[PDB]
Each structure stands twice: as structure tokens, then as C-alpha cells.
């Protein structure tokens, strides 16, 4: 299957 | 991006057939266009009449004819090259790991194959300004050596939200050679939704040494491996991701050539041979490439991922 | 824990077939799920129709798809790391011997390989509070060097009922390479009933030097060793135990590399190289690991098992 | 004791095959049980069908499965430890030369290796009350240094019929490395009839220095030595005798390590390093052992065999 | 086979 | 081969 978070789209990794 | 297969219904294809195609792995118009007539016949609810219609309609949506080297040199100059996290190593690859192609990294144990795959799985999310791919990563692992704590260590180096980076790595543990191929069909589905920029199979040939034992199963081993490597090449054309497979080695007793035989030597476009240097340094070497010259570079494994020789 | 194979009958599998599976080594749903279609075909009373049914039903009971590194970093942070009985050594391994993976300890003679396996066979029964695994131990021994009096000496150190500790160590003496593999099929049965937390094969490659003589039997030697190491990896995934194999060494006359060749170098995730220090001190060294940095520690063999350098 | 191979006929084995097995070295059911399937195939009148039958039937007669450390600690506490004729030395070995295992005694010349083997060849016949083995002795000698007058001198010390003691020592002079191994096949036959309690090969590696010359014959030298040491380990399990081999030394010119390399270092369970003390005193030292701590003792060679430092 | 005690389940080692 | 005395069985060594 697909995870409920793997189906989420890409997110530009915020800095830290 | 790639056109989703739903665009075939708007061209005179039964929405039932699209469901019969999507149950066979095809999710984009490209996947159906690049497919041979033989594959569509092998589907149950598809006949030679439909398959000729499906291929004809899909061919209208994607260019499958001649062009010029000028129009290709233009389209190629805009290709993404993911950085390896090492200035010395990227200067060897003339940019970095190239997308839309299969790259292979083989070598003895400890030579940093899994470590490069962890660095790549992070730097593929940097903005293209910083030398990345601005996409998710997909890490198929056939050994059980996927360590998330090594991704956090690299995110700290590039100043990224370690919690956000681990959300862009779709991990999957393959347990045999059949499961390893099954994961690619599910992989073609995910890449239609999100935007993956790097596919990693490490190791691509680990499970082929044991599932297929002696010489009596040699022919079946390579034909099964050839379909896998072919199915990767299809993902590299469908979605333009970067396929980076790792390979084990074997001694020649007649002094370490990679396994897989000629099936994996021809299929892969770039081959990187990783030696053991001194201490924490390693030596990569362009073993085979269409464009890059044969040369060696010296990188190292540091506490913050793969980086230049910190010496 | 792992689901027993009896749960396949409740999903539409003939209870006769489950008996035909359990006669082939499979005792958990995982063992059947992780198995390739090829292995089930090789069973007599199983056909391609049944095997496709068995694989399909079993796949529904155990996750064999993609997840996220976030969901994997969570599940991994709750993994058990058994202490080695040495504060200096555990600080090298960042916790201790990690379960769900194959660990290898090689070195010259006297370097404390068998001694570490005796300490591990005891400390794997301590409560997790004290750094153990809260499970039984399984000590396959291919040399005849299993000394119970060395387990009692370690139980006295940790204050355990020496009579009770020796009840949690399932000892088995392998006499050849075929018998060594046969013991793993019987091992998969026991781990379903009780709760074993540590598997020890010492030495894993002792019997491969003599059963397979020269180079003429080299190919068959490694293919037989590859199946063994693969069958261990399956136990590490089925039951999540900790596999700790020991390896002999060989000189290179062209200064001591471990035997087994590339087959055992790729298969094992963590390799510990044990040198001889001074007096009773020894020097362990992270030879290969996916996460741990290359570093050395100094432990010692004491009258109460492996412990820190009592100096 | 060990079950003779004739008990296989009563379980459905052709009495012709038992004769074909007994012509291959196997004389007990154990020897056939511990044997791999590969060895029985290498016999002429044996096929894969028979060998699978032979292994299956023999496995029913001898336990080859798991037990518990408790059941093993019990069975081990009743093991025989032959005295060395020295109170100071037995206190080092915690009882004496342990049966069912391979013990090695190496050192420079004159250090009393042959002298200990002569004392052991006598004290192995004392009743267990007095610390012996109540069995015959088998003294394979590859140097020509077997002196019966040294056995009489020890029999006088323990008050034994010197004429009767010399009847319990089966002496055999090996003249090359092939003959040295051939003597072990004949040795397995004798131990079925009588009750031998001590096997002595002195020196075990004397003939390997000269029969195999330079480095060009190094690989073949160790593989031939590995089969010999393996065939001794089989005798220690078949009959539960005590194998006490002696080893020569070699200087390291880069200060005296024993020869044989890693092949003999891993195979032997207990190693005793004998130095030269003062006058007639010598210094034994636990070089390697699974249970005994690293320590030194001081014995001496007296006119009545090996004894304590008479000073 | 299996010992009559090897088939027994795990027991938390009591102190002493 | 085997000696006519090596084939003889064990004998408890008599005292002297
Ligand atoms: N955090 C770290 N810091 C420094 N060095 C590390 C770290 N983690 C691993 N290493 C080193 O990197 C090497 C391991 O490399 P890697 O995991 O890529 O191996 P590999 O080529 O995949 O091997 P195999 O074939 O066994 O899977 C070892 O030398 C190890 O000591
Ligand atoms: N009870 C004890 N107290 C102290 N030291 C001991 C004790 N038992 C064994 N030793 C020491 O530990 C070492 C033996 O280590 P170990 O049995 O683990 O060897 P190993 O690496 O398995 O060797 P091999 O390849 O020969 O099997 C020797 O130095 C021996 O003197
Ligand atoms: N009857 C005896 N009384 C006293 N000392 C003796 C007697 N016989 C031999 N020795 C002494 O014992 C030593 C010989 O020991 P041994 O025969 O065991 O040597 P080794 O270690 O086998 O040597 P090599 O490697 O030359 O064979 C010498 O010091 C010798 O003087
Ligand atoms: Ca790896
Ligand atoms: Ca190529
Ligand atoms: Ca050992
Ligand atoms: Ca490895
Ligand atoms: Ca001598
Ligand atoms: Ca040893």
C-alpha cells in the first residue's frame, strides 16, 4: 500500500 | 512532467481499459507509449484491436520520432545533476549524479556504497541553486542497512529540518527478488502523484546471489535481472528520476570484478568503482561512462555524510 | 511478535498445505511472505496455483510496501541493543549488539571471540532496564568450545540464578556444514514457541575451511555459505533476534584478513576486528558498519566474563 | 561408548554398503552421522539415494539436535581430565589434560614436549581415582623420539607393572605427511575394539615443514594440515579420547611463534607454551583456552618423568 | 529433536 | 596392519 504520509506531496526542506 | 494515463480517456479509450492498464503497472501515457505491442496483448481484457488503438492514440501525445542533435543538446543542457556532497567527487562526475539514467556504484565492503546513497537521499532535496533535485527520494533497500540517523547527520550539514527531510524519503525493504521487482510497480504509481527526483536500489543484486543458486539457475537469474534493470530504465524515462543502484563484488581466482555479469554492465550507463583509501578516505573511479573520462577522485566518509577528504 | 503460520488457515489455506509448508521450514506468516515464489514451487504438494494463493493471502497479513523514513526512524528507535558487559565497548557500538541484524566478530586466536559470545549469551537475559534483551539465547557451536562454567561466572557478576541462566541457553553442536544449516530450520521452530533474543553461530565459517578443500570446491563453498548467511538474515527479520557470528582469519602472503570472502563481507552489517592487546586486554575495532564510525575500543577478558580493562 | 557401524544393518542398510563404508574410514554410527552428505557421495558404491538413507537412519541413533546448557553442564561435569604428573601443573589446567578436545604443546627444543607426552602416555592408564583415564594410549610419532625406557621410569613412580604398561601403548612411526594421515584411519578402527583414552601426535607439524617446501606449496600445506586437524577433532568426538599434539616453533625476524599458522591456532582448543626455566625446571603457560585463565606454572623434568619442581 | 527443557518458555533470571 | 598385541584389549596395569 501507501503510507498516509508517503502519499503527501513534496515539501521544500525548511532551514534550521 | 509526465502525463497521467487518465488523458487517454479524452482520446477515445474506454475508461474500463485504462483501469485494466493501471492494473498492469502503466500509470502515465509514456509508460503505454514506450511499451511494446506484445506487453499490452499479454493483458487479459486487451485484444490486438484495442492494443493497436491504445498505442496509436498514445503515440500522438508523446514525441516518438526523429529530431536533431541540436534540439537534443538543448534539451539535455537543462538536465539536473544532483551533488554528491563532495566538491572533489562532483568535479569527477562533471556536475554530479545525472538524472534520467542508471548509475552503478560497486566495490568491496565498507567502501561507502550505502553511505553515498544516504548522502544522495538528502542532497536530492536541496534547491537546484545549491545543486540538488528539489524532489523526494525513494530508497529501496535489499539488505536492512537503511539508517535514518545518517540522513539527519547530513541534513544538519546542509541546514535542513531533519524532521522534514525524513518525510521525503519513501523507504521500502525488499525481502527477495520477486518482491524487489514488485516494489517497482508500486513505485511507478507514487511518482505520478508526488515529485521524486532520485531512485535508489541498494543493493540491486544482493538478493540475486542467493535466490538463484548455482550455474543451473544462471540463465533464469540474468533474465530476471534484465527485466528489473529494464524496468528501472523505464522509470528513468517516464519520470526523469536518477537511478543509483549499488552492486557487490566477486573475486576472480584465475582482482575483484562486479557481479551481475554482462547484463548489468551494458544496462548501466555510469559505473563507479569505490576502493578503500586510508583511514576514512575512499577512492572513486569512473569505471564506465558515455561522456566522462576515465579518472579517479578521493572522497571520504565523515560524521556528516559523504564529504571531501577532511585532511 | 511474529504471527504463527496457523493464521493462514483462517484466510483460506488448506490445513494440509500448512503442514506441507511447516515441513519445509516455514513456521511464521512472515517466513512465507518474505519467501519467493520459487521456493514454494520447489515444495512437492504445492503448485503454482497454490503458491500464488499462499503468497497473496500472506502478503495481506504483513506489511510489504513503502513507508516513510519518519515512520522507520520511529520504529527503529525502539530497537533493543544488548550490552556486551563492557562500558568502554558499548560506547563504541553506541548502545551494544544491535538486534535484527547480523554482527560478525573475527580475529586471530585467543582474541576473545568465544568469550564475547559467552558474555552475550548471558547479558541477553537481563531486563532491558539493565541493558539486555529479556529473552533466551541460542548458541550454535561448530568447534566444541562451549563452556557452561563461563556462563555461570558471568551470572555471578550480574547477580543471576546460575541455575536459571543455564536454562535459557539452547546449545547445539554442529558437526559439519550440512548439519550447521539443518540446525537453523529447527531453530526457526523453537523461536516461535519461546522468546529467543540472541542467536550465536561460533564459528560460522570454521567448518567451511575443511569440508570444502581446494579451489576446485571454492564455488560450491561460497554458494553453500551464502544460503546459510541468507537463512540467518531471515531469522533476524522473522523474530528480530540478534545474530552474532564469529569468523576465523587467514594470512595474506603477498596482514590477516578474515575468511569467507566477499560473500560474508557483504552479508554482515557490523564487523568487529579483535586484536591482542597486552596481558588480558584486547582491542575491538569497528571494521564495517552502516552507522558507527571507524574507531577502536579496549576491553579485557576477566574471570567474570568480558569486562572493561580492569587496570 | 560409541556405537559400532554394524548397528546400521539392523536399521535397513545393505550389509554390502556397511562394508563399503568401513572401507572409507567410518567404523562407528557417529562417524557416519557427523559426516557430511558430500563425503558419502565421494564413495564409489554409494549414490545420493543411499547416502540420504544412510544419513537419515544414522541420525536416529545419535542425538544431533538442540539441548540446554543445563543438560550440557551436567554431561560435561563427568568428563575425564588426565593428570600430567605434576600437582603444580594440574592446578594450572584445573584438573589436567581434558578429554574430548585437542590440546597443543609448543615450544623451543628441549622444553619437554616429548617428555610430557611420555608422562601422559603412562598416567592415562591409572584408575580415575588416581587421576587418569583407565584406557590405552596411542602414540603417533613423526620424529623417531619415542623412548619406551621413559615410560618404564614413570611406571615405577606410580607403581605399575612396567611390562603391563608397555602393552597399552600402540606406537606408530609416521614417515611423511600422507602416512601421518593414513595412520588416523587405522586409528579409528582400533579405538572401536579396545578402549583408548589418549591420542598423541608428536610432532603434528614436524613433517609439514619439509614435505611442503616454500611459499609456492603453502596453500596445499595448510589445506592438507586442516584435514588432519579436522580428522583428529572427529576422533575426539567419536571416542572421547584426549588429543595432545605437539608443535615446533619458528622465529619472527621483524620472538618465537608456533608454526602451522592460523590453521592450527583456531583448530586447537588449549595451547601450552613451554619455556626453558633453570637447570631442569620448565615453565608452562596457558597460551589459549576457552575456560582457563592466562597463567604460568613451573614444572620440571625428573628421572621419573614429568613432575613438580623437585627443589 | 527438542529437549524436554529446551521446549520450556523463557524465565526471567531470578536474582541471588 | 595391527600387531598381534595391539589388537589385545585393555588391561588394568597391575601394581608392583
Ligand atoms: N557515522 C559514521 N561516521 C564515520 N564513518 C562511518 C559512519 N557510519 C559508517 N561509517 C564507515 O563507513 C563504512 C561503511 O560504508 P557503507 O555502509 O556504505 O558500506 P557498503 O559499501 O554498503 O558495504 P556492504 O557491502 O557491507 O553493505 C565503514 O568504514 C564505516 O566505518
Ligand atoms: N576464565 C578465564 N579467565 C581469564 N581469561 C580467560 C578465561 N578463559 C579464557 N581466557 C582467555 O581468553 C582467551 C580465549 O579466548 P576465546 O576462547 O574467545 O578464543 P577465540 O577467539 O574463540 O579463539 P579460537 O579461534 O581458538 O577459537 C585466552 O587468552 C584465554 O587465556
Ligand atoms: N631421563 C631424563 N632425566 C632427566 N632429564 C631428561 C631425561 N630425558 C630427557 N631429559 C631432558 O629433557 C629435555 C628433552 O625434552 P624433550 O625430549 O621433551 O624435547 P622436545 O621438546 O620434544 O624437543 P624437540 O623439539 O627437539 O623434539 C632435555 O633437557 C633433556 O636433557
Ligand atoms: Ca550496504
Ligand atoms: Ca554500461
Ligand atoms: Ca572459539
Ligand atoms: Ca557488510
Ligand atoms: Ca620431540
Ligand atoms: Ca584455538
Numbering used by the authors:
A (entry chain N), E (entry chain O), F (entry chain P): 3289 to 3304
B (entry chain G), C (entry chain F), D (entry chain E): 21 to 274, 283 to 339
Question: What's in the article?
Answer:
We obtained RAD51 NPF structures on both ss- and dsDNA with bound TR2, which showed clear density attributable to the TR2 peptide. TR2 decorates the outside surface of the filament, binding across adjacent RAD51 protomers. BRCA2 residues 3289 to 3304 could be modelled in the map at the TR2-RAD51 interface, with no appreciable difference in binding mode between filaments on ss- and dsDNA. BRCA2 TR2 adopts a bipartite mode of binding to the RAD51 filament. TR2 residues 3296-KAFQPPR-3302 bind in extended conformation to an exposed groove on the surface of RAD51 ATPase domain that includes the acidic-patch helix. The polar side chains of K3296, Q3299 and R3302 project towards the acidic patch, forming a basic stripe that complements the charge of RAD51 D184 and D187. TR2 amino acids 3289 to 3295 extend beyond the acidic-patch groove and reach the protomer interface, to interact with the adjacent RAD51 molecule in the filament. Residues 3292-PAAQ-3295 fold in a single-turn alpha helix that packs against RAD51’s inter-domain linker sequence, shielding the RAD51 residues that mediate self-association between protomers in the filament. We were unable to detect additional density for TR2 in the vicinity of either ss- or dsDNA, indicating that RAD51-bound TR2 does not engage with DNA within the same filament. Our results provide a rationale for the biochemical observation that BRCA2 TR2 stabilises the RAD51 NPF, as TR2 binding across the protomer interface acts as a molecular brace for the association of juxtaposed protomers in the filament.
The BRCA2 tumour suppressor protein preserves genomic integrity via interactions with the DNA-strand exchange RAD51 protein in homology-directed repair. The RAD51-binding TR2 motif at the BRCA2 C-terminus is essential for protection and restart of stalled replication forks. Here we used cryo-electron microscopy and structure-guided mutagenesis to elucidate the mechanism of TR2 binding to nucleoprotein filaments of human RAD51. We find that TR2 binds across the protomer interface in the filament, acting as a brace for adjacent RAD51 molecules.
